[PDB]
Design a protein around this ligand. Structure first.
Ligand SMILES: [Zn+2]
Ligand SMILES: [Zn+2]
Lengths: 210, 150, 18, 17, 67, 37, 11, 157, 289, 218
């Protein structure tokens, strides 16, 4: 009886998801019929080289001479509501942090302890290579410093072989390599994902040739 | 008290029995090795699986068709898995074993192939090759053949 | 730049020689 | 051992002979 | 200073799938006449662990003006 | 019978795996690629 | 037969 | 460490959690795992015991062979019912069980009595900077060590 | 072959298309050929089921007829099996036995002696040891100065239990269960507590006794030998083509094998728990090549 | 890859231009096919379809399944380095580095709280000589409990509780790449449903026959 009702609830939820998908596609068609006529077809993969674990059969939707991709429906509506909940939680915490003062100083002190521990952890993993006499740090812990906005600025060499990256509260431009970085991270994107992560977070990088 | 001496003496004979048995096992397996490498050289193993004859080659699709039906069970290996030859029985009642070198095992079947190999493999014989005496013999024999011609 | 200020006011002191 | 087929192909082989 | 190039020597197909899945997960569609949806305890717990609901002390609106 | 309360809201594809950045970061990602649209 | 750890048969 | 990935180190957890089945976008977990780990828990190679072991083998050979001759002849022409459970440490059995779930086959090399073995047992500087900026190295596409370069140069010599 | 290709291309796809289930579920339009196919399936199932009934029930009646024509306390026997099972398996390793019933359901064997082996409850130090012959036992007992029906009955019920366990091992599956506090204890005991003085003394042996001899060993023998954990040294060649072991019993102590490359070699080498080192050369050994 | 190495792809007629005056008959489709007036498309065998389409040999692989790399060109098919006499261990590592050392034999044992807790938290702390942090363990366990959901719903479907088809749509919705491969998800629900009722009718008819055969010998 319990599993039967669980099955019925799952059926109703997927029925609502399919109905939302149908009405969203109807809205998409109504909104963008102003441009051209539909050319729905399953375009067979012309690559023949997708050994990178990439999907096949790129569905090419043309409304006339234009391009458009069919989107998800219920996933977007969940993301909108959850982003809204995130924003209202931030607003509530901000308001209760300008109303309260004691928990305000406790909160900033806890964040100071967070930053202190993060700095100690990220600077426990460096060395000074006296042979070539430069401040060298494990490139592995570099995205960690990227995730916690620890990177001040990055100067990228030509031909994308090595970096010179500054740290906040410090005056050293550390020398960090890329070849072993991609040798270690060939499965998550590597330097491409790294560069697009400094570009997504707006970390200032300068292209220089030496 | 002396029953403990009985127990320890039977423990000694048990341990020595295990030692003799593993000795006999190792003696048997090197004896089989010497028997194989001796009986192959008189032509008595010719036509058998250990010393088969060359026939038509086999492609990749035929090879996984052989492997999926658990047919190929005696295999010869060379050069990092770039060359694998399959040995199969053919009805001649005489039953004769034949060699077919499989064509272009492409790059990367191994993660599945060794997944399916271990279920049907009974005996591997890899023909690992030396390089320096081989080249020495090749150049000396080339001089010998051309000197004999001239 | 708030994190930069907080990192500036309590600068690190470590060693680790290599 | 390593055969040289024309148009420059080096084919690896079994043991020898 | 800060500079950039619209023509990087990076990979191509990975950028194609990055952009396509970015369009597929967001598109352009916003919404305003909607209410907040309460997440499950799993989602809330993981976002607490990543500190997403950590409030904006970085901005100088009123968060860091008093301190 | 314990996970099913959350799994019913977790059968909704996988948004938590989809969410991996901020809103402003995603906006910058959207605006900073090429001008094909 | 092989090895058939509890969670294959229990769940 | 690249031959036996198990340390008999943090790549283990990433390999068993994330890598086993597009972008996946998540490299921060790796760093958060390894850097979120605080360690809180004689160069002399002795040659004597490995020399004494084979002498002990030499001593045992006499009795073993005499017992074998006295018992067995040759002519010219229980426990848990899985064998890998025997005579190993407990963790050897714990890690063998993950493999023996699918790989039950021991390959069974106990049979030798074919036609191939007749015998049977009987148990009883103006343009230099322009040249610098000109050169196209932006795509690497190579994918070692400098001493390897040394021997390559010597071999080319 | 010419007709076989046309068969595979047209008939079987159209056979499934006719046997498709968009019209099968509607019972009001079932054609005669559909009913003929239904009868074919029913007759095949009847044939297979009756055949397997007869094939399964035949050896049972065979053994019943064999028993009909052919025709020291139980606590002590259970304790003797307990002592042998304590001797055999390490602590922290339980084995449940399920019996395959004729109907098709796996039943739990609660009387398996692998279920409660490690759980607690002058002459008997000898009665719990069947590892020495009765002739030697009697010859030694006379030399001790001190019942043959007891050993006879022990032998008889020993062979009875042997034949019963041989019978019950035909249609059965087994499930292992672990005792992780004991697995963790063995971990602390023999993995971080492995204090053998042979830390890296495996390859320099090869380098020193280059002037020894090693004969050839097979592959599947090496796998089956490593599964039972009789190997305390595995020393690779740099190019994944050769092996030099230093084995713990027998003569000669060191062999040669050659290896095809499979991950499960790493898996079995680590599952046995064997020390792994690396034989590193100079450059001059590769430079005179 | 387009046959997934099998060498037998499914040939399908996508669109057929029918002459004005006929019906969509399989014979007229074949008549258009023998004159090549129907769209012959090749589909990989990876897409498990409920109807077995006509499987013909793959035009790309010539029945082999192995393709030479077109990036490797004939002019650049040759090297000049003495690699065969001087094979180093890095060639052994290069052929080694694409077989992945299967984690699946332990991962399919990790569907249990005790085993996955031992492998996931404690054993690295023991061998390495360190300790985790609280948020690290929490994120590990949270992502693991997110990962276990697919085989949870798989086990729920496999019991064949009434209305398992809704749970089966849940299975195909939570994670598609694993859902396209498992045999536990039947492609056509009415097919297996009426095949189950047909097998039931078959087994009762079999027992009635096996019982009525016993009343002719007395
Ligand atoms: Zn093909
Ligand atoms: Zn190529």
């Amino acid at each position: 009886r319990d599993s039967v009702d669980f099955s019925l609830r799952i059926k109703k939820r997927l029925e609502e998801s399919k109905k939302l998908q149908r009405d969203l596609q109807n809205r998409i068609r109504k909104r963008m019929k102003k441009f051209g006529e539909e050319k729905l077809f399953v375009q067979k993969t012309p690559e023949g080289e997708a050994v990178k674990g990439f999907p096949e059969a790129e569905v090419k939707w043309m409304f006339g001479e234009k391009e458009v991709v069919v989107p998800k429906a219920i996933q977007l509506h969940l993301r909108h509501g959850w982003k809204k909940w995130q924003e209202e939680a931030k607003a509530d915490l901000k308001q209760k942090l300008l109303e309260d003062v004691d928990f305000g100083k406790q909160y900033i002190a806890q964040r100071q302890e967070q930053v202190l521990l993060d700095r100690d952890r990220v600077v426990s993993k460096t060395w000074y290579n006296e042979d070539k006499s430069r401040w060298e740090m494990d490139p592995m812990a570099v995205p960690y410093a990227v995730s916690r906005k620890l990177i001040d600025s990055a100067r990228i060499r030509h031909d994308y072989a090595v970096m010179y990256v500054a740290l906040k509260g410090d005056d050293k431009e550390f020398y960090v390599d890329i070849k072993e970085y991609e040798m270690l991270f060939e499965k998550f994107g590597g330097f491409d994902a790294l560069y697009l992560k400094m570009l997504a977070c707006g970390i200032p990088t300068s292209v220089h040739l030496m | 008290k002396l029953r403990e001496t009985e127990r320890e003496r039977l423990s000694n004979m048990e341990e020595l029995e295990r030692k003799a048995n593993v000795q006999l096992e190792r003696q048997l397996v090197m004896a089989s090795d010497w028997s194989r490498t001796l009986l192959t050289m008189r032509g008595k193993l010719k036509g058998t699986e250990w010393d088969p004859e060359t026939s038509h080659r086999i492609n990749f699709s035929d090879f996984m068709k052989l492997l999926d039906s658990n047919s190929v069970q005696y295999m010869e290996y060379s050069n990092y898995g770039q060359t694998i030859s399959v040995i199969l029985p053919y009805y001649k009642k005489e039953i004769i074993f034949r060699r077919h070198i499989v064509d272009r095992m492409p790059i990367d079947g191994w993660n599945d192939v060794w997944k399916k190999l271990h279920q049907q493999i009974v005996n591997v014989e890899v023909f690992n090759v030396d390089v320096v005496p081989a080249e020495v013999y090749t150049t000396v024999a080339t001089f010998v053949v051309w000197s004999m011609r001239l | 730049x708030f994190l930069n200020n907080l990192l500036k006011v309590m600068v690190x002191f470590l060693x680790x020689x290599x | 051992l390593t055969v040289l087929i024309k148009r420059g192909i080096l084919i690896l082989i079994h043991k020898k002979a | 200073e800060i500079h950039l190039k619209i023509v990087p020597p990076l990979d191509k197909v990975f950028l194609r799938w990055l952009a396509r899945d970015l369009q597929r997960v967001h598109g352009f569609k916003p919404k305003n006449n909607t209410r907040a949806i309460t997440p499950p305890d799993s989602y809330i717990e993981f976002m607490r662990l990543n500190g997403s609901l950590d409030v904006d002390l970085d901005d100088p609106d009123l968060a860091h003006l008093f301190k | 019978x314990x996970v099913x309360x959350x799994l019913l809201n977790x059968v909704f594809x996988x948004x938590x795996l989809x969410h991996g950045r901020x809103x402003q970061x995603x906006x910058x990602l959207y605006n900073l690629m090429x001008x094909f649209x | 037969x092989x090895v058939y750890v509890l969670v294959i048969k229990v769940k | 460490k690249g031959l036996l990935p198990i340390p008999m180190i943090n790549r283990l957890i990433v390999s068993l959690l994330y890598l086993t089945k597009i972008r996946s976008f998540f490299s921060d977990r790796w760093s958060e795992l390894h850097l979120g780990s605080n360690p809180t828990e004689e160069q002399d190679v002795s040659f004597v015991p490995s020399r004494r072991s084979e002498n002990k083998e030499i001593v045992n050979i006499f009795k073993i062979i005499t017992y074998l001759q006295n018992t067995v002849s040759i002519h010219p022409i229980w426990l848990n019912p899985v064998k890998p459970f025997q005579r190993s440490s407990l963790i050897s059995s714990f890690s063998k069980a993950n493999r023996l779930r699918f790989l039950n086959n021991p390959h069974h090399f106990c049979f030798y009595c074919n036609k191939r073995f007749p015998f049977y047992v009987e148990k009883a500087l103006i343009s230099e900077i322009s040249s610098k900026s000109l050169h196209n190295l932006l795509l690497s596409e190579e994918m070692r060590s400098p001493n390897v370069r040394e021997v390559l140069y010597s071999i080319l010599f | 072959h010419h007709e076989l290709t046309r068969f595979k291309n047209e008939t079987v796809p159209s056979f499934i298309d006719w046997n498709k289930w968009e019209h099968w579920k509607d019972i009001r339009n079932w054609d005669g050929k559909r009913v003929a196919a239904l009868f074919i399936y029913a007759f095949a199932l009847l044939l297979s089921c009756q055949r397997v009934y007869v094939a399964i029930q035949a050896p049972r009646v065979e053994r019943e007829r064999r028993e009909l024509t052919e025709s020291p306390s139980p606590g002590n026997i259970e304790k003797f099996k307990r002592n042998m099972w304590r001797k055999a398996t390490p602590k922290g390793l339980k084995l449940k036995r399920f019996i395959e019933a004729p109907d098709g359901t796996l039943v739990h064997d609660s009387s398996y002696v692998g279920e409660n082996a490690w759980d607690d409850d002058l002459k008997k130090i000898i009665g719990r040891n069947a590892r020495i012959q009765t002739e030697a036992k009697k010859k030694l007992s006379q030399d001790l100065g001190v019942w043959r029906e007891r050993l006879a009955t022990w032998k008889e019920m020993l062979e009875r239990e042997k034949l019963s366990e041989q019978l019950n091992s035909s249609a059965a599956k087994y499930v292992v269960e672990f005792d992780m506090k004991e697995v963790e204890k063995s971990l602390r005991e023999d993995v971080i507590g492995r204090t053998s003085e042979t830390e890296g003394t495996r390859a320099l042996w090869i380098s020193k006794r280059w002037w020894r001899y090693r004969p050839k060993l097979p592959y599947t023998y090496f796998l089956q030998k490593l599964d039972s954990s009789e190997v305390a040294a595995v020393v690779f060649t740099e190019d994944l083509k050769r092996l030099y072991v230093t084995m713990k019993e027998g003569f000669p102590l060191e062999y040669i094998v050659d290896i095809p490359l499979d991950p499960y070699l790493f898996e079995t080498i680590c599952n046995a728990g064997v020390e792994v080192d690396l034989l590193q050369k100079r450059q001059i050994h590769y430079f005179m090549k | 890859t387009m046959c997934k190495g099998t060498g037998s792809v499914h040939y399908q007629i996508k669109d057929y231009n029918l002459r004005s005056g006929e019906k969509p008959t399989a014979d007229c489709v074949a008549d258009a096919i023998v004159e090549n007036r129907a769209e012959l498309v090749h589909l990989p065998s990876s897409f498990n379809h409920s109807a077995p389409l006509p499987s013909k040999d793959c035009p790309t692989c010539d029945g082999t399944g192995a393709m030479s790399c077109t990036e490797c060109k004939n002019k650049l098919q040759v090297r000049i380095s003495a690699d065969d006499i001087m094979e180093p261990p890095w060639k052994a590592y290069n052929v080694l580095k694409k077989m992945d050392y299967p984690y699946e034999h332990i991962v399919h044992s990790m569907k249990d709280p005790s085993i996955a807790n031992f492998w996931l938290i404690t054993l690295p702390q023991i061998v390495g000589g360190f300790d985790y942090d609280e948020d690290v363990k929490k994120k590990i366990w949270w992502q693991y409990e997110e990962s276990m959901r697919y085989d949870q719903l798989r086990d729920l479907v496999a019991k064949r509780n009434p209305g398992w088809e809704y749970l089966q749509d849940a299975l195909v919705s939570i994670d598609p790449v694993r859902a396209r491969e498992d045999p536990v998800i039947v492609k056509n629900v009415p097919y297996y449903k009426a095949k189950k009722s047909l097998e039931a009718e078959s087994q009762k008819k079999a027992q009635k026959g096996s019982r009525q055969r016993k009343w002719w010998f007395f």
